[PDB]
Amino acid sequence: PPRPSSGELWGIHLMPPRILVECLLPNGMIVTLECLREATLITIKHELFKEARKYPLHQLLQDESSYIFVSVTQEAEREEFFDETRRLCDLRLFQPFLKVIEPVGNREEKILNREIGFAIGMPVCEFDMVKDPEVQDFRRNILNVCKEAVDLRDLNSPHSRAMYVYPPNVESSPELPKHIYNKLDKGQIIVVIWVIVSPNNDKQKYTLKINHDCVPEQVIAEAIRGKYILKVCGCDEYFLEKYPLSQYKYIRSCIMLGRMPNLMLMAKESLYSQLPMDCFTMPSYSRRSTKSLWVINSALRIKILCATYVNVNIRDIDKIYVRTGIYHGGEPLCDNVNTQRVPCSNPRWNEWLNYDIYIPDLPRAARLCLSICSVKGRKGAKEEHCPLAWGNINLFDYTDTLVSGKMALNLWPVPHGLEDLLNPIGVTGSNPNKETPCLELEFDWFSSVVKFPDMSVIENDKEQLKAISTRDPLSEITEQEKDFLWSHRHYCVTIPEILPKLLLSVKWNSRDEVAQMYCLVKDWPPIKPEQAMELLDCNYPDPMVRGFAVRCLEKYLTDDKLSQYLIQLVQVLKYEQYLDNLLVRFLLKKALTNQRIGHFFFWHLKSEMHNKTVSQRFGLLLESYCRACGMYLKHLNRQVEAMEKLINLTDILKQEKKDETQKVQMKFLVEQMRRPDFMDALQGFLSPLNPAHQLGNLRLEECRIMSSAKRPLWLNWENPDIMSELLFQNNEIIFKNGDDLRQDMLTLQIIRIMENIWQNQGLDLRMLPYGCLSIGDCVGLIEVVRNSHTIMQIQCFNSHTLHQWLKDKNKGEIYDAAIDLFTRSCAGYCVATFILGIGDRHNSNIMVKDDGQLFHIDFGHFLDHKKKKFGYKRERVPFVLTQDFLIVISKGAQECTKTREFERFQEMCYKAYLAIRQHANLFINLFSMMLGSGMPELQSFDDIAYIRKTLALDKTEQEALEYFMKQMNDAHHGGWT
Amino acid sequence: QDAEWYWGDISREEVNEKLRDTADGTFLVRDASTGDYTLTLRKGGNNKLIKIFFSDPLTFSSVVELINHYRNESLAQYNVKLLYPVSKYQQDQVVKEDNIEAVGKKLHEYNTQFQEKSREYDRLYEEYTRTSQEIQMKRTAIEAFNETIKIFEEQCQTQERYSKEYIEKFKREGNEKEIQRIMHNYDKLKSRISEIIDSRRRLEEDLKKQAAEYREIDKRMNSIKPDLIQLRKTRDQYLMWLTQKGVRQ
Ligand SMILES: COc1ncc(-c2ccc3ncnc(-c4cccc(C(=O)N5CCN(C(C)=O)CC5)c4)c3c2)cc1C#N
């Protein structure tokens, strides 16, 4: 199992300076040895055999070089310590003992399996114990993707290995918005190329003006006035591919902010030789009469036998029963069927349930969704039904065999907030925890194995069709429109974007209609990636549909957008019926050919390894990734062991030392962080927020424990880059242990996507979506904004205090730029927080830079979080602009609502709000792809209906602007025209 | 407007909760979310939406004519019958205070009781999660205690195998100190195993008790969950009555 805590022993967070270790010699003797907690295994083995001579039968012991240590890990693993340069406190021992053995077996294979199991947080050997044939087949079959990617990684020269480690961070399009081009000097950009000479490392400055779309080699040629490469000053970002200079995200951002792009010229061999050579090797497990579905001539029937136990007291609940239902995604294929009600203390049924669906009419993605509910007559005539445990079963397996025979299924606890009786969005399969309610089942037998048929065996006018294709995915579609889409199913090829609408019009409980829809998607023209992602959500579970969507991403999804929407693409992996599918093969392929993609591919999976619903699927996928990711597994293990010592340190602060002052906890912090084992782990590794940022030496003088009850850690690192002054010299990150940061991560991702939509449409509304990465169960990192202060700090009671503070810092001719930046940042956050339903803002939520840039923090709650707790249904305005902000926008003028600056501020809000409304399908799809992540405020499609209200999608575009205008007037009490 | 099945201005999500787990034939008409009218009919586990204009040239003069006709007639002409209406007056009861001040005072009672039960349910869910996590931690530590005891028992086997052949040579040699040092180390090894076995024993009792604690927290939550749902819906009824019995824009 995973380790229960990050401590150095079981029940002991931190080893004492000295500790007794029971050493089990290979002659049967046992020697107690006092060791320092930071002593290496080389030192301990030498101290052991020096003392073993004073114990009996020492003549039997061989030389110490012929031995290694083995012990029981906190993960219950019998780990062999081939790396004898490791400290005792880093071995993650369950108890302080070591057994001396002679190394056997494949040494190099055991060393790699140890490093893979360390990155995943789970011993790799537990995958060998799985009896499930599908699990073992995934481990062998997925190796094709690993071989294809590593072969593609060294097919070319070291340049291919460089494109893997340092990929180009470029936009999806070379074109420039007209508000970006107008900042250029006649289409040319002034950049500064730096060169570090060979002796004394002297830096030389070279300002040069070139075309904005100059290929990086052209930039080098101007500097000469040629085989070198360019690098961003301050981080590990390289200009290796022949993209236009303006298309690189760093250069594109410099043109926006009016900042000077500082690049650095270095030789190609300086980086090509620095790259290690990744070599993938095949693991050990890779070496070691049936009827058809359409032949069966009967209706569907499933037998519920018994349930082992149910946790309910007979005083409050009257009876219990098993509710079932056949589903294709989120919709049933027939009306749900229940069992007869039985007593709570005796949960036995032995009852066949008849579903009114002919067996050949069952689709490929058909699933059985059941649960054990409790009924209570209680008051009045109505009765209350409450689910006690749920479970979902794929009616077909990966072999395509229909389920048959008896089957025991361990059920899952009902998720918090879920009030439905069934949970078709939950994962399929049995609960690994065998100490749960087990439900006995039995499917009918057809005297043979039943297999699914093969693909060979399976065979208004233009308007209104267009009007339906432009509606949002959650828009209402009537039965008249379903019959209209299905009757015009062949003309829909001219409008390929209507495919999601057409698929929901298909009668999936009809073998005839599904057979014809398969042939249409076989020859269906491609669609945009933003639209194919919808076909990967829970509403579309058909293999042919999901496969079509994956093929659209294989050809049309740039690595820019792949990294942008990677959070959602990882989430829809748990919507898959089986471990092996085209989606998981596509993502793993891209993660193994792009280290920027594979970095967050790894952490998004690793952050959910605690979740027992997806821990097996994500564990098998992380194994294949770490098996073939190359030398980056070394860097990832350094990031992991650094996060483990931060988790262990924060756990001590809020458990054993929770009742102690700030000075006592700070003294324990500075004393513990200065230890050698701690200093080796938290210095010299890549930032999990951005792997291009190198975290160097810790600045312990700047590290603090914030005054929150969760005790967040304010950490500071040096930038070991040779030119840190041109980017950032200090890297400040907030480590938080205790709070769930998934909603912050999603909201900051949505904010960045909204800002990109605005920039492409000529709206320069500057947002600040700082980094935020969930790394585990309520553990995460948060990027620090360098020169920012909350509004409360600015006040520390005049409304002009904020405006007078911005008059300072930006005094002089840079005043109009600060007011302009403050107005544009306010416009973006006023629209964004209204659409998303972010929690109410106050003097501590809102921060302002010395730049004048305003932004928000702590996006803990989104959508309609207050409707369940308070019956009133209203679309709140979280960011009500007080007079303090109005004075700043109006440059100190009284009667701020009637000024010229406020009217221009309103145009920014109207343009931004309508721009996001035009891209409503993107955000509705992004929220829909997260319905299975387990976030409490995103469980069903009814939770997504909130942005349908704020964006006013069921109205006209002109009516929606009147709605947004009335919401601003109701919150600001007037002034919005 | 006085029809039982007509609810007027209600959202599509409110119809899903009303038609949740209903039989084939349950229907209700509402103002279309924009058409003018939309009929929602439960059939085959899905809440079918049917626009009201409703197909081809109109055959009915009023909406009340369209509903009552189709209830008896069945909907086969288009492609089940409208068997069960969702009466708007069915929920008129349970709000019996019948004056503007009595309601609202009863709403304040129900809303207060709902916030008490809501905080009780939340804190119970935190004990529920914390107990589930600590049970998983104890099972892992018992797995590690199993493997540790196997290793120390292997040390007894290895000491026994190597010894005896050596202790009988020490007996003919007459060295009693060498025998005493082997038996002393064997006593030290066996006593340690007894300490590890007793440690796993106490951990199994703590897990045995904590499993029953999880079992009772689960029962308590399965009993307060139904009462929390009905208490919120009762509060929402008294709140809805207060908005209706008040000034409208
Ligand atoms: C969802 O959780 C979160 N979300 C975002 C951030 C977050 C993100 C970026 C930030 N960038 C810059 N500053 C902060 C920030 C915020 C609040 C307080 C401080 C601070 O330590 N002060 C001490 C000195 N002082 C005095 C004496 O007046 C000024 C206040 C710094 C930031 C906080 C943090 C968390 C958490 N936990």
Nearest CA to ligand 1 atom 1: A858
Q: How far apart are CA A87 and CA A41, in angstroms?
A: 6
| Dihedral angle sign, alpha carbons of residues B149, B150, B155, B161 | positive
Residue with tokens 């086969």: B76
The two three-digit tokens of residue A218, written as one number: 């052209």
Which atom of ligand 1 sits closest to the CA of residue A741? 1
Cβ-contact A635, A685 below 8 angstroms: yes
**What is the nearest CA distance from B102 to chain A, expressed in angstroms?**
18
Rg of chain B on CA atoms, in Å: 36
Tally of domains in chain A: 5
Interface test with A, best of B151, B195, B213 (most A CBs within 10 A): B151
**Which residues from B are below 8 Å from A313, CB to CB?**
219, 223
Final residue belonging to a domain, choices A403, A428, A444 = A444
- Phi/psi of residue B42, each to 5°? -80, 125
* Burial of A382 (C-beta count, 10 Å sphere; 0-12/13-18/19+): exposed
For residues A286 and A330, membership in a common domain is answered with no
Cβ neighbour number for residue A410 with a 10 Å cutoff: 18
**What is the nearest CA distance from A563 to chain B, expressed in angstroms?**
33
**What is the nearest CA distance from A388 to chain B, expressed in angstroms?**
7
* Burial of A850 (C-beta count, 10 Å sphere; 0-12/13-18/19+): middle
Q: How far apart are CA A180 and CA A818, in angstroms?
A: 19
Q: How far apart are CA A330 and CA A538, in angstroms?
A: 7
Q: How far apart are CA A171 and CA A165, in angstroms?
A: 18
Cβ-contact B20, B12 below 8 angstroms: no
CB under 8 Å to A725, separation ≥6 — which residues? none
Cβ-contact B11, B33 below 8 angstroms: yes
The two three-digit tokens of residue A143, written as one number: 């190796």
Cβ-contact A654, A661 below 8 angstroms: no
Q: Is the CB of A787 within 6 Å of ligand 1?
A: no
Show me where chain A is broken: residue before each gap, C-N > 2.5 A: 225, 288, 459, 796
The two three-digit tokens of residue A381, written as one number: 């005539």
Question: Domain B98-249 carries which CATH code?
Answer: 1.10.287.1490
* Burial of B249 (C-beta count, 10 Å sphere; 0-12/13-18/19+): exposed
Cβ-contact A397, A331 below 8 angstroms: no
Resolution in A for the shown PDB structure?
A: 3.0
For residues A572 and A586, membership in a common domain is answered with yes
Final residue belonging to a domain, choices A415, A444, A473 = A444
**Helices assigned H by DSSP within A81-169:** 107-120, 125-128, 133-141, 143-154, 158-165
**What is the nearest CA distance from B5 to chain A, expressed in angstroms?**
19
User: What is the per-residue burial (b if ≥16 Cβ within 10 Å, else e) of A791-816?
Assistant: beebeeeeeeebbebbbeebeeeeee
Domain range for A482 = 445-629
B222–A416 C-beta distance less than 8 A: no
- B105 three-class SS: helix
Residue A750's Cβ-side half-sphere holds a number of Cα atoms within 13 Å equal to 29
B232–A868 C-beta distance less than 8 A: yes
For residues A640 and A554, membership in a common domain is answered with no
Cβ neighbour number for residue B104 with a 10 Å cutoff: 18
| Dihedral angle sign, alpha carbons of residues A139, A144, A149, A150 | positive
For residues A862 and A850, membership in a common domain is answered with yes
B219–A312 C-beta distance less than 8 A: yes
Q: How far apart are CA B231 and CA A721, in angstroms?
A: 61
At B26, the amino acid letter reads: T
Cβ-contact A112, A280 below 8 angstroms: no
Ligand 1 centroid to residue A751 C-alpha, Å? 19
The secondary structure of A246-304 as a DSSP string is: GGBHHHHHHHHHTPPPEEEEEEHHHHHTTS--------STTT--EEEGGG--SEEEEEE
**If you measure CA to CA, which chain A residue comes closest to B13?**
A942
B125–A416 C-beta distance less than 8 A: yes
A334–B140 C-beta distance less than 8 A: no
Of B34, B159, B189, which is closest to A954 when you measure between CB atoms? B34
Q: How far apart are CA B69 and CA B65, in angstroms?
A: 6
The secondary structure of A41-86 as a DSSP string is: HHHHHHHHHHHHTTSTTGGG---GGG-EEEEEBTTS-EEEE--TTS
For residues A493 and A536, membership in a common domain is answered with yes
**What is the nearest CA distance from B95 to chain A, expressed in angstroms?**
14
Cβ-contact B182, A50 below 8 angstroms: no
For residues A260 and A321, membership in a common domain is answered with no
For residues A450 and A518, membership in a common domain is answered with yes
Q: How far is CA A956 from CA A912, A952, A953, in A?
A: 16, 8, 7
**Which residues from A are below 8 Å from B144, CB to CB?**
10, 72-76, 94-95
Long-range CB contact pairs, A29-36, < 8 A, 24+: A29/A55, A29/A56, A29/A57, A29/A58, A29/B159, A29/B185, A30/B155, A30/B185, A30/B188, A30/B189, A30/B192, A31/A55, A35/A88, A36/A88
Q: How far apart are CA B208 and CA B218, in angstroms?
A: 16
Q: Name beta bridge partners: A101.
A: A68
Cβ-contact A6, A647 below 8 angstroms: yes
DSSP element (H, E) containing B116:
helix B102-162
**CATH number, position A167:** 3.10.20.770
The two three-digit tokens of residue A915, written as one number: 């721009």
**If you measure CA to CA, which chain A residue comes closest to B216?**
A311
B144–A72 C-beta distance less than 8 A: yes
DSSP element (H, E) containing A385:
strand A384-394
Cβ-contact A79, A114 below 8 angstroms: yes
- Parts of chain B belonging to CATH 1.10.287.1490: 98-249
Cβ-contact A951, A915 below 8 angstroms: no
User: What is the per-residue burial (b if ≥16 Cβ within 10 Å, else e) of A274-304?
Assistant: ebeebebeebeeeeeeeeebbebeeebebbb
For residues A614 and A636, membership in a common domain is answered with no
Which 3-state string (H, E, C) describes A190-213? Answer: EEEEEEECCCCCCEEEEEEEEECC
Chain center to CA of A263: 31
The two three-digit tokens of residue A316, written as one number: 């409050």
**Which residues from B are below 8 Å from A78, CB to CB?**
147, 151
**Which residues from B are below 8 Å from A942, CB to CB?**
13, 16
- The number of helices, as runs of H, and strands, as runs of E, in chain A is 33, 32
Q: Is the CB of A782 within 6 Å of ligand 1?
A: yes
Q: How far apart are CA A328 and CA A364, in angstroms?
A: 9
For residues A440 and A474, membership in a common domain is answered with no
**If you measure CA to CA, which chain A residue comes closest to B151?**
A99
Angle at B78 between CA B75 and CA B79, to 5 degrees: 85
Distance separating the N- and C-terminal Cα atoms of chain B? 20
Q: Is the CB of A857 within 6 Å of ligand 1?
A: yes
**What is the nearest CA distance from B247 to chain A, expressed in angstroms?**
16
The secondary structure of B27-72 as a DSSP string is: EEEEE-----EEEEEEETTEEEEEEE---SS---SSHHHHHHHHHH
The two three-digit tokens of residue A874, written as one number: 């209203």
Q: Is the CB of A778 within 6 Å of ligand 1?
A: no
- B179 three-class SS: helix
Q: How far apart are CA A857 and CA A880, in angstroms?
A: 15
Of A331, A419, A478, which is closest to B229 when you measure between CB atoms? A419
Q: Is the CB of A770 within 6 Å of ligand 1?
A: yes
CB under 8 Å to B203, separation ≥6 — which residues? B138, B141, B142, B145
**CATH number, position A686:** 3.30.1010.10
Strand ranges (DSSP E) for chain B?
Answer: 26-31, 37-43, 46-52, 84-85
Ligand 1 pocket mutation pick from A737, A783, A857 by most atoms within 8 angstroms of CB: A857
The closest of A102, A82, A88 to A43, measured between CA atoms, is A88
The secondary structure of A726-769 as a DSSP string is: TS-SEEEEEEEESS--HHHHHHHHHHHHHHHHHHHTT-------
For residues A874 and A941, membership in a common domain is answered with yes
For residues A582 and A653, membership in a common domain is answered with no
Rg of chain A on CA atoms, in Å: 31
Interface test with A, best of B20, B219, B236, B243 (most A CBs within 10 A): B219
Q: How far apart are CA A217 and CA A238, in angstroms?
A: 12
Q: Is the CB of A858 within 6 Å of ligand 1?
A: yes
Q: How far apart are CA B148 and CA B192, in angstroms?
A: 11
Q: Give, to the nearest 10 degrees, the angle between helix A143-154 and helix A158-165.
A: 120
Angle at A299 between CA A295 and CA A303, to 5 degrees: 120
Q: How far apart are CA A210 and CA A244, in angstroms?
A: 11
Ligand 1 centroid to residue A925 C-alpha, Å? 32
Which atom of ligand 1 sits closest to the CA of residue A704? 21
Nearest CA to ligand 1 atom 14: A784
Q: Is the CB of A736 within 6 Å of ligand 1?
A: yes
A72–B151 C-beta distance less than 8 A: yes
Final residue belonging to a domain, choices A246, A270, A293 = A293
Cβ-contact A912, A901 below 8 angstroms: no
The two three-digit tokens of residue A322, written as one number: 């098993």
Q: Is the CB of A712 within 6 Å of ligand 1?
A: yes
For residues A353 and A246, membership in a common domain is answered with no
CB under 8 Å to A326, separation ≥6 — which residues? A300, A332, A333, A334, A355, A357, A362, A366, A367, A368, A369, A395
B13–A942 C-beta distance less than 8 A: yes
The secondary structure of A536-559 as a DSSP string is: GSTT---HHHHHHHHHHHHHH--H
**Which residues from B are below 8 Å from A5, CB to CB?**
137
Residue B91 DSSP code: G
The two three-digit tokens of residue A482, written as one number: 């379903």
Ligand 1 centroid to residue A791 C-alpha, Å? 12
Nearest CA to ligand 1 atom 20: A706
CA dihedral A234, A240, A241, A245 (to 10 degrees): 40
Ligand 1 pocket mutation pick from A702, A734, A746 by most atoms within 8 angstroms of CB: A734
Q: How far apart are CA B92 and CA A777, in angstroms?
A: 46
- Residues in chain A, overall count: 977
**CATH number, position A494:** 1.25.40.70
Q: How far apart are CA A641 and CA A807, in angstroms?
A: 46
**CATH number, position A951:** 1.10.1070.11
At A330, the amino acid letter reads: G
- Residues in chain B, overall count: 249
The two three-digit tokens of residue A575, written as one number: 């919507």
**If you measure CA to CA, which chain A residue comes closest to B142?**
A76
The closest of A68, A113, A253, A290 to A177, measured between CA atoms, is A253
Interface test with B, best of A476, A507, A863 (most B CBs within 10 A): A476
Which atom of ligand 1 sits closest to the CA of residue A714? 21
Which atom of ligand 1 sits closest to the CA of residue A860? 1
Of B44, B111, B162, which is closest to A60 when you measure between CB atoms? B162
Cβ-contact A392, A423 below 8 angstroms: yes
Long-range CB contact pairs, A339-342, < 8 A, 24+: A339/A304, A341/A375
Angle at A234 between CA A232 and CA A239, to 5 degrees: 15
**What is the nearest CA distance from B186 to chain A, expressed in angstroms?**
8
